[PDB]
């Protein structure tokens, strides 16, 4: 623990060797123990300021981060013959209610007292009050219509360039491989659409020898060509769809089509699903240039261009809002080797609760890395759970108010987050403020509710509730500050600042949060002093400032930057942190101080290293865990033992250029390293690819762009940053 003050200018080794853990609200024992899991729900300030004035003085953003549909190990599912909910604010009977008349409960959000119905009976022993996370079975009035069936619509771009990337094969291959794993019962419907300068529908009838490629060429007046076999029943037509998946790849080899009419294609896609809603998977490979939705080419910046982001058209935004209203979500797969204006395309996913996936310069032969990455991202994509036609709401105790939402969705009337689809990998953030002084209360609560239709046609409500203590002291607010959560909430904020103003402003606002918070701190207590809880605040922000999302002097391209922002906006806190500030470990010398508890596996636990090239060593090997991928950097003067016993090579010179993964050798060293890597991968459900390719000369050493602590020709070093902060803090 420690309520101690820290001087960032003297330590310079603050970063711990063990993974950071989320703070623990300063609550009584019995309450904290029922609190919601922090990987699911969390707050920037575990100690809620009592007044807006107090909040403002601390100069720290107040907000919540959430991962509502996260895969869980054990989920309490109540099938209650009635959902107990406060009669005023409609909050769900939770563990933080005040039971008094043991036949009357005090709602912890609006204080009103309610009656416990003769069905809820020791009413306090009920599951709804012994669990912060729980799933309810929605009664008939929680659905505007019969549970929609699961509907998947794959829309593939088949332009000349698309054909040249050769992605269609793997996509089709993955679909075949995972046809039976797609969430859903016998009601599942699947469909397919390809497109170039025209829209290509595909009918599937058991009575016919082969699938019909129905082509509509009227780009300004799209329409569904047939009424019965375009969205077929997977269960009954499994065979029919399997031939198609084996046929498509071989269909456009000789194509001469050069233009892509993504706009019209999506509108056609829309009309086909409009009736049931569902999930539309779009795979695009280039700038759209035909028909409505057309986008002009743009010239890529360079390390020379200043900080002088937003969509060039609203077509895709308008379209998404339409998809949203029909319970249609759109996931975007961009595998482009040239600018494609993702800044405008992304809109199709942001506002429809979809998500975008980016595979820069994807090529079946030339880019082995993007190939395996797509494979594994499709694996998770195609097999993770899914919820349909959903909505979510976040309620907070009176006095507190949410004023800004972050994430892919559409906000109906304040806090009626519309979610056509809801996936287990999406994260969300919220910004609140104290509208009414919490003088009355000493504890506040937050409750989010996810109303959706399962892949099995069942309306369900998953609920999470977080309880936190209220404090009236600047010192108490800082003691509870969650440095990572603040980092995350600031990124979301910064992204909007980018779109809303400029990248410069966004970058300043970021640096100001650190400066103003620390400055406020100092004016309330020689070197840069900060409380323990914020000892990593400048580090994580600097990291945030050097990321592909906000970095400047770099040679980063448009789509990459935007894709990075798309991730800040949709990714759960942890992945945001693993990406911005990747975990670095030395791995050519692992040993036994690990989790050698796991029955027959040891699992070394090497210490975490700070992201500086000064922690490296030309005699070792370093692994960097950046969440989505794992890069293993090998030193030029690495030991022979690691070359042959781990890499399987006899000398550094022969370490294969692109190396997609480690070989599994019959060697203790290999077993130790494979063990560590495999454990890392088990800590997430999105198999991260690994690549050693980071040689000392593979011109792929983009392992370094992460040593966020060193100085670049166009970036301050960690130490310089501290120097600049201190100059401002006590100006």
């Amino acid at each position: 623990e420690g309520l101690r003050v820290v001087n960032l200018l003297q330590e310079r080794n603050m970063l711990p060797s063990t993974p950071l853990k989320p703070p623990v609200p300063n609550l009584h024992e019995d309450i904290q123990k029922l609190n919601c899991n922090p990987e699911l729900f969390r707050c920037t300030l575990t100690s809620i300021p009592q007044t807006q004035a107090l909040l403002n003085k601390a100069k720290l953003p107040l907000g919540l981060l959430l991962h509502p549909f996260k895969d869980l190990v054990q989920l309490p599912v109540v099938t209650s013959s009635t959902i107990v909910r406060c009669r005023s604010c409609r909050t769900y009977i939770n563990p933080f209610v005040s039971f008094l008349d043991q036949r009357r409960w005090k709602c912890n959000l609006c204080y009103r007292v309610n009656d416990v119905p003769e069905e809820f009976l020791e009413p306090h022993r009920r599951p709804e009050v012994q669990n912060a996370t729980i799933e309810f079975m929605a009664p008939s009035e929680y659905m505007l219509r019969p549970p929609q069936p699961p509907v998947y619509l794959f829309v593939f771009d088949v332009s000349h360039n698309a054909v040249e990337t050769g992605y269609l094969n793997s996509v089709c291959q993955s679909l075949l491989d995972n046809l039976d794993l797609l969430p859903g019962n016998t009601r599942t419907k699947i469909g397919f659409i390809t497109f170039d300068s025209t829209i290509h529908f595909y009918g599937l009838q058991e009575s016919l020898s082969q699938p019909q490629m129905l082509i509509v060429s009227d780009i300004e007046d799209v329409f569904i060509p047939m009424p019965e076999n375009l969205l077929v029943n997977l269960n009954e037509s499994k065979e029919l769809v399997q031939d198609l998946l084996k046929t498509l790849p071989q269909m456009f080899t000789k194509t001469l089509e050069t233009q892509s009419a993504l706009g019209p294609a999506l509108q056609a896609a829309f009309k086909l699903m409009s009736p049931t809603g569902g999930r539309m998977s779009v795979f695009q490979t280039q700038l759209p240039t035909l028909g409505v939705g057309a986008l002009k080419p743009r010239e890529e910046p360079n390390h020379r261009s200043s900080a002088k982001m937003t969509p060039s058209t609203d077509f895709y935004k308008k379209l998404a809002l339409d998809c949203s209203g029909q319970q249609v979500a759109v996931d975007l797969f961009l595998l482009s080797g040239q600018y494609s204006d993702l800044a405008s395309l992304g809109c199709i996913s942001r506002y429809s609760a979809g998500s975008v996936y980016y595979y820069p310069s994807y090529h079946h032969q030339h880019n082995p890395v993007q190939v395996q990455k797509l494979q594994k991202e499709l694996q998770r994509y195609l097999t993770r759970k899914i919820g349909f036609e959903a909505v979510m709401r976040i309620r907070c105790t009176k006095g507190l108010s949410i004023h800004t939402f972050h994430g892919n969705f559409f906000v109906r009337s304040t806090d009626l987050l519309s979610l056509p689809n809801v996936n287990p990998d999406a994260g969300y953030a919220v910004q609140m403020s104290v509208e009414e002084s919490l003088t009355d209360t000493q504890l506040v609560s937050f409750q989010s509710a996810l109303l959706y239709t399962s892949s099995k046609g069942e309306r369900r409500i998953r609920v999470h509730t977080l309880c936190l203590p209220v404090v009236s002291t600047l010192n108490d607010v800082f003691l509870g500050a969650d440095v990572q959560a603040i980092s995350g909430l600031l990124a979301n904020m910064a992204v909007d600042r980018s779109m809303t103003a400029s990248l410069s402003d966004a970058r300043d606002a970021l640096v100001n949060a650190v400066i103003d918070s620390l400055s406020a701190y100092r004016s309330s207590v020689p070197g840069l002093m900060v409380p323990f809880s914020l000892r990593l605040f400048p580090l994580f922000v600097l990291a945030l400032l050097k990321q592909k999302s906000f970095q400047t002097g770099t040679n980063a391209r448009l789509d990459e930057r935007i894709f990075a922002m798309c991730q800040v906006k949709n990714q759960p806190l942890v992945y945001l942190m693993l990406t911005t500030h990747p975990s670095l470990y030395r791995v050519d010398n692992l040993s036994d101080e690990g989790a050698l508890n796991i029955s027959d596996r040891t699992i070394p636990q090497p210490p975490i290293l700070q992201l500086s090239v000064e922690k490296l060593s030309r005699d070792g090997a370093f692994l960097m865990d950046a969440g989505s991928v794992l890069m293993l950097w090998v030193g030029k003067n690495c030991t022979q033992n690691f070359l042959s016993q781990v890499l399987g090579v006899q000398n550094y010179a022969s370490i294969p250029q692109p190396m997609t993964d480690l070989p599994e050798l019959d060697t203790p060293e290999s077993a130790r390293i494979i063990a560590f890597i495999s454990w890392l991968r088990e800590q997430r459900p999105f198999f991260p690819i690994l690549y050693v390719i980071a040689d000392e000369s593979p011109m792929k050493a983009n392992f370094l762009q992460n040593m966020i602590e060193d100085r670049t020709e166009s970036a301050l070093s960690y130490y310089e940053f501290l120097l600049h902060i201190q100059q401002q803090v006590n100006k």
């Binding site: 959902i83 909910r85 409609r90 929680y142 659905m143 979510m392 109906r412 009337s413 009626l416 109303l451």
Partner: peptide, 7 residues
């Protein structure tokens, strides 16, 4: 009258 409410 939104859906997840009931009032």
């Amino acid at each position: 009258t939104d859906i997840e409410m009931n009032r």
